[PDB]
Amino acid sequence: SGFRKMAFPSGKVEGCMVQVTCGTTTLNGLWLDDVVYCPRHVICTSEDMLNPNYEDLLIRKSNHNFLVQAGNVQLRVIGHSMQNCVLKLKVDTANPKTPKYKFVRIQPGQTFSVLACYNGSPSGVYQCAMRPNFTIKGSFLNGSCGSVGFNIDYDCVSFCYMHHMELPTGVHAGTDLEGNFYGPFVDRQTAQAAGTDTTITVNVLAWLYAAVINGDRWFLNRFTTTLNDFNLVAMKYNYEPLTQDHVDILGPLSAQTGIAVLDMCASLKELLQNGMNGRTILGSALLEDEFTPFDVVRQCSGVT
Amino acid sequence: SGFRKMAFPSGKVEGCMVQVTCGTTTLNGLWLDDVVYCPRHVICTSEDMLNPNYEDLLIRKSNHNFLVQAGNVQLRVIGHSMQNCVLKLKVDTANPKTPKYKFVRIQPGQTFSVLACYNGSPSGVYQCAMRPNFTIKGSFLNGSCGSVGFNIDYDCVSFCYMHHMELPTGVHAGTDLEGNFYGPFVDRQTAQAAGTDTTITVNVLAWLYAAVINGDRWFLNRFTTTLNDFNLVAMKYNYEPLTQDHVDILGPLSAQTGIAVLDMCASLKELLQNGMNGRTILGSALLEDEFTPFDVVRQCSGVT
Ligand SMILES: *CC(=O)N1CCC(C(=O)N(C)c2ccccc2)CC1
Numbered sequence: 383s384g385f386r387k388m389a390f391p392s393g394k395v396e397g398c399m400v401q402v403t404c405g406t407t408t409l410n411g412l413w414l415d416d417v418v419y420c421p422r423h424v425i426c427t428s429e430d431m432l433n434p435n436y437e438d439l440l441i442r443k444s445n446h447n448f449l450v451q452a453g454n455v456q457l458r459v460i461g462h463s464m465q466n467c468v469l470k471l472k473v474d475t476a477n478p479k480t481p482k483y484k485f486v487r488i489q490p491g492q493t494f495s496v497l498a499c500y501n502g503s504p505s506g507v508y509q510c511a512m513r514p515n516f517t518i519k520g521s522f523l524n525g526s527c528g529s530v531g532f533n534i535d536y537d538c539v540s541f542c543y544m545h546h547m548e549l550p551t552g553v554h555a556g557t558d559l560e561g562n563f564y565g566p567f568v569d570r571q572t573a574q575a576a577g578t579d580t581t582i583t584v585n586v587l588a589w590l591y592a593a594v595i596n597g598d599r600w601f602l603n604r605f606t607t608t609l610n611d612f613n614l615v616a617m618k619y620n621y622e623p624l625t626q627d628h629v630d631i632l633g634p635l636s637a638q639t640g641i642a643v644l645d646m647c648a649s650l651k652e653l654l655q656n657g658m659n660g661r662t663i664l665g666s667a668l669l670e671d672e673f674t675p676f677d678v679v680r681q682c683s684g685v686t
Numbered sequence: 687s688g689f690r691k692m693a694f695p696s697g698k699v700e701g702c703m704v705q706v707t708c709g710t711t712t713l714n715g716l717w718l719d720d721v722v723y724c725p726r727h728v729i730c731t732s733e734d735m736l737n738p739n740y741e742d743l744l745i746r747k748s749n750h751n752f753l754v755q756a757g758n759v760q761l762r763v764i765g766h767s768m769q770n771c772v773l774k775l776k777v778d779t780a781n782p783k784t785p786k787y788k789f790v791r792i793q794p795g796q797t798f799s800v801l802a803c804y805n806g807s808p809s810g811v812y813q814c815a816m817r818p819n820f821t822i823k824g825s826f827l828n829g830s831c832g833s834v835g836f837n838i839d840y841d842c843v844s845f846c847y848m849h850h851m852e853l854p855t856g857v858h859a860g861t862d863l864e865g866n867f868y869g870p871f872v873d874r875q876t877a878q879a880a881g882t883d884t885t886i887t888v889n890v891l892a893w894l895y896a897a898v899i900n901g902d903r904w905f906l907n908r909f910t911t912t913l914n915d916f917n918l919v920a921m922k923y924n925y926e927p928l929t930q931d932h933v934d935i936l937g938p939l940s941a942q943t944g945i946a947v948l949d950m951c952a953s954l955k956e957l958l959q960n961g962m963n964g965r966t967i968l969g970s971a972l973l974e975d976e977f978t979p980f981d982v983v984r985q986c987s988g989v990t
């Protein structure tokens with residue numbers, strides 16, 4: 383028992399982190415096979431970032447300008463191309479530690495682990511969620527750009543995120559591994575405000591199931607609700623509307639605990655309308671929304 | 687910017703996890719050099735655990751009874767000995783992936799990362815603290831025993847914890863790597879209740895500094911306090927008494943932010959006496975105490 387915010391083991395991704403330098407700028411790169419992926423803003427100067435024309439700035443760069451270092455050994459760059467907002471630096475050596483991998487584009491509500499790196503060196507690992515406004519609440523300093531978000535399915539790493547920007551409100555923006563930003567964010571230093579940060583309703587319900595499974599049951603009540611009734615309450619509190627897909631996705635947890643999804647919705651409805659009353663659920667004083675139903679199932683069963 | 691509960695990169699420790707089986711029981715073992723460390727309760731049957739005489743149960747076991755498997759390759763056991771509550775299985779092969787390491791016994795308030803494993807396979811990584819009552823709030827299922835807690839100082843892993851028990855209240859107990867349990871817990875299925883779970887005051891103050899550094903400043907007030915006055919309030923709310931050592935330990939953070947430690951104590955005093963008033967600090971609705979001043983400094987600067 384016990385339920386914790388748990389990141390995937392980072393070993394497989396640590397073996398992929400390299401340091402990329404272009405001029406005065408040093409950020410991280412992901413080394414898979416003979417390609418190093420990194421944010422294209424590595425070629426910008428602090429002046430360029432205000433309004434950069436990346437195709438133009440890239441014409442001024444050659445293979446030898448991209449300094450790629452894996453630990454203390456330098457990698458030879460034999461090609462360079464821009465794919466959307468990432469650079470793909472072809473190296474002469476395939477990464478011997480390349481795990482089995484996929485590049486996936488996740489949806490908001492989906493969670494992943496971030497291996498925070500600086501100078502191609504990993505510093506820590508934490509669990510994030512792609513927020514419904516396509517931002518992530520990360521922990522990234524200068525030098526952390528190029529750090530990746532991933533999920534692991536047994537031995538295959540599904541890379542979903544690469545860090546690019548910090549919005550002036552402290553939230554983070556980045557791309558999938560094809561260089562397409564999540565949401566409307568651009569790799570430009572401009573006025574990009576994040577939209578409403580809605581709460582991931584299905585994730586809160588999943589975490590309520592995790593709590594019942596681990597002994598925290600005080601919030602269970604004698605009520606039920608409907609999807610439409612619950613949604614009126616979810617609307618009021620800036621929660622994602624609950625769909626029959628989310629109800630179906632919650633099925634395995636409903637089955638295991640014996641609590642119908644709509645009854646758990648009525649518990650969540652009461653928690654929204656009345657607060658926690660100074661109580662906690664899984665050691666938290668607010669409704670946690672960065673555990674998916676799959677994360678709850680994984681942790682509650684011990685998937686490796 | 688952004689502050690997250692961050693675990694150390696788990697790569698170095700993943701390469702040490704092995705599966706240990708003794709009879710019907712399968713748990714995890716730590717493979718460093720030619721020794722595999724595992725909880726001594728691996729030799730118990732569910733009947734034995736009520737009142738086990740480990741020296742007696744161990745006489746019935748030989749080197750060939752300890753089945754040690756690293757991935758799909760079996761390790762030959764050439765020796766076995768009991769050190770306090772852990773078994774040390776000498777193998778014929780030194781772990782090629784043995785990182786630089788230390789075995790350290792941490793104090794309560796100190797934090798570490800747990801690589802949760804099942805059948806010698808890592809499932810996830812999360813950050814814990816050794817609670818002042820010598821328990822940890824982990825996430826461990828059956829099969830997770832033998833999972834370790836660690837800290838990393840550049841390339842040296844300091845192993846501090848090995849999982850052994852789950853108390854009937856959902857909290858966890860284990861040993862350092864010399865087999866000595868933290869606190870008064872024993873590897874016996876008996877009535878072991880955890881003591882008062884006091885809040886790690888110095889860690890809360892450190893996390894308040896992390897919050898100011900990242901933009902959350904609403905809780906800052908026009909008050910100050912003394913160590914003795916603050917301690918009257920800390921006593922009332924089951925907080926650890928603040929010492930001049932903790933004030934000194936907070937020095938670097940006080941210096942960086944310009945907020946005197948005692949002024950931050952007065953902010954913490956007001957938060958204790960008045961609550962958060964439905965507000966949050968670093969995305970949390972309660973006072974976080976599992977970030978040490980060193981963790982705040984590390985994350986706020988990007989130590990790899
Ligand atoms: C996220 C990251 O690693 N980086 C973005 C900020 C950047 C930096 O420190 N400065 C000042 C800069 C350089 C070039 C272009 C814009 C801003 C380091 C890399």
Ligand SMILES: *CC(=O)N1CCC(C(=O)N(C)c2ccccc2)CC1
Nearest residue numbers: 711713730731732735828829830831
């Ligand atoms: C923590 C851990 O991995 N283990 C302790 C519980 C144990 C188990 O499932 N049972 C039923 C058991 C076996 C032997 C002795 C006591 C309890 C699996 C290992």
